[PDB]
Amino acid sequence: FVNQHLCGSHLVEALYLVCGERGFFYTPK
Amino acid sequence: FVNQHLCGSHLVEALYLVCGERGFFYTPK
Amino acid sequence: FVNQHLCGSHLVEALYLVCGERGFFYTPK
Amino acid sequence: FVNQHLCGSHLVEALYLVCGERGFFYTPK
Amino acid sequence: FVNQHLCGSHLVEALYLVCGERGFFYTPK
Amino acid sequence: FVNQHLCGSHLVEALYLVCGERGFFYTPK
Amino acid sequence: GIVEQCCTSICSLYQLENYCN
Amino acid sequence: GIVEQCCTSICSLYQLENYCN
Amino acid sequence: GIVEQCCTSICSLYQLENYCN
Amino acid sequence: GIVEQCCTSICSLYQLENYCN
Amino acid sequence: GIVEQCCTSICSLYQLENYCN
Amino acid sequence: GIVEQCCTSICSLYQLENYCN
Ligand SMILES: *C(=O)CCCCCCCCCCCCC
Ligand SMILES: *C(=O)CCCCCCCCCCCCC
Ligand SMILES: *C(=O)CCCCCCCCCCCCC
Ligand SMILES: *C(=O)CCCCCCCCCCCCC
Ligand SMILES: *C(=O)CCCCCCCCCCCCC
Ligand SMILES: *C(=O)CCCCCCCCCCCCC
Ligand SMILES: [Cl-]
Ligand SMILES: [Cl-]
Ligand SMILES: [Zn+2]
Numbered sequence: 001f002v003n004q005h006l007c008g009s010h011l012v013e014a015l016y017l018v019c020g021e022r023g024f025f026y027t028p029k
Numbered sequence: 030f031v032n033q034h035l036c037g038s039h040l041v042e043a044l045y046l047v048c049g050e051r052g053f054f055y056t057p058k
Numbered sequence: 059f060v061n062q063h064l065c066g067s068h069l070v071e072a073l074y075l076v077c078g079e080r081g082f083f084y085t086p087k
Numbered sequence: 088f089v090n091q092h093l094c095g096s097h098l099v100e101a102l103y104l105v106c107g108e109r110g111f112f113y114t115p116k
Numbered sequence: 117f118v119n120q121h122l123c124g125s126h127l128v129e130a131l132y133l134v135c136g137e138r139g140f141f142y143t144p145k
Numbered sequence: 146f147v148n149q150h151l152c153g154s155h156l157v158e159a160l161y162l163v164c165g166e167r168g169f170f171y172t173p174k
Numbered sequence: 175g176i177v178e179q180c181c182t183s184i185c186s187l188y189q190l191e192n193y194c195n
Numbered sequence: 196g197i198v199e200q201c202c203t204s205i206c207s208l209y210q211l212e213n214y215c216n
Numbered sequence: 217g218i219v220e221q222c223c224t225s226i227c228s229l230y231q232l233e234n235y236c237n
Numbered sequence: 238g239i240v241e242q243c244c245t246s247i248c249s250l251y252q253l254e255n256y257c258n
Numbered sequence: 259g260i261v262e263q264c265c266t267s268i269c270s271l272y273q274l275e276n277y278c279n
Numbered sequence: 280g281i282v283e284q285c286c287t288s289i290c291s292l293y294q295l296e297n298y299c300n
């Protein structure tokens with residue numbers, strides 16, 4: 001599915017900003 | 030260094046597209 | 059239409075990454 | 088030079104918005 | 117709502133490019 | 146300076162995510 | 175506002191200019 | 196996961212913080 | 217074209233390579 | 238201005254909050 | 259080329275128009 | 280680390296693959 005891919009594309013950018021030095025693990029559905 | 034932050038914001042999207050279902054981990058520190 | 063415009067916005071970025079030095083031609087529908 | 092890659096990733100989106108239905112060509116080399 | 121958030125995410129980038137030195141005010145619905 | 150333009154394009158998305166319903170103003174000059 | 179118009183129809187460069195300071 | 200929650204409802208900054216290391 | 221295919225189904229890296237010069 | 242504060246030094250999320258309406 | 263003109267000097271929107279099909 | 284390898288030198292797509300889960 002495509003629109004989920006689009007939201008995840010913006011989701012990782014939002015996580016990168018919010019977390020910062022801590023980082024994050026991105027696991028999709 | 031802000032330039033580091035900018036490339037990191039490009040690295041997360043590069044990992045997102047490359048990994049896909051596997052997922053990625055972003056650990057600068 | 060708008061959501062196609064959104065997907066094309068991410069599509070050109072994905073093409074830019076994947077192609078690299080070769081480049082690409084982007085022709086919409 | 089990574090900075091070149093970053094601006095190129097901004098150039099593709101600038102061409103995408105500007106050209107629209109016409110389309111664009113990205114040829115660094 | 118999410119897809120409106122996605123379009124606004126691309127909308128601010130489009131406004132930033134088009135306006136330039138003038139700038140803009142972004143007020144959502 | 147193009148590097149200024151690149152970070153500004155990252156600043157607008159940072160303001161967009163942070164402000165949300167409140168909105169933001171981008172005034173370099 | 176900007177969301178109501180340009181997120182329902184594609185906005186031309188002049189329409190985006192209307193939102194500039 | 197992150198996709199199931201934040202791609203169906205808008206996630207607040209604290210909810211995004213829950214995914215940080 | 218690229219919009220008709222990759223915006224209706226997820227395109228794999230080889231499919232994106234098909235659009236490269 | 239925002240250009241002289243948040244782009245010559247890395248701004249934390251709160252430093253981005255100051256320019257919100 | 260576009261890399262030698264629009265990325266070593268800031269290109270206005272019209273300078274981006276030159277590379278459109 | 281990824282910051283010390285892929286951002287001080289341009290990383291090809293495969294060099295991005297190394298940080299996948
Ligand atoms: C991966 O396969 C995604 C799993 C989540 C299901 C997505 C669809 C859920 C219902 C949405 C229907 C709206 C689209 C017509
Ligand atoms: C340009 O005019 C786009 C041409 C492709 C048609 C888009 C719509 C196809 C069917 C989608 C319906 C879903 C939206 C309600
Ligand atoms: C904020 O609450 C958004 C206000 C605009 C309403 C969005 C929905 C309008 C009709 C769209 C239905 C399509 C989604 C199923
Ligand atoms: C209008 O031009 C804004 C006035 C301040 C501009 C400062 C530009 C400084 C040059 C860039 C230095 C940092 C590079 C990442
Ligand atoms: C292929 O490599 C393109 C040939 C021209 C490349 C010029 C690179 C100049 C180095 C970057 C200078 C500006 C940094 C923002
Ligand atoms: C945490 O801060 C990561 C440790 C390594 C940081 C290296 C930063 C180097 C400065 C930037 C050089 C390249 C600019 C594009
Ligand atoms: Cl989208
Ligand atoms: Cl950048
Ligand atoms: Zn999007």
Ligand SMILES: [Zn+2]
Pocket residue numbers: 035039093097151155
């Ligand atoms: Zn950038």
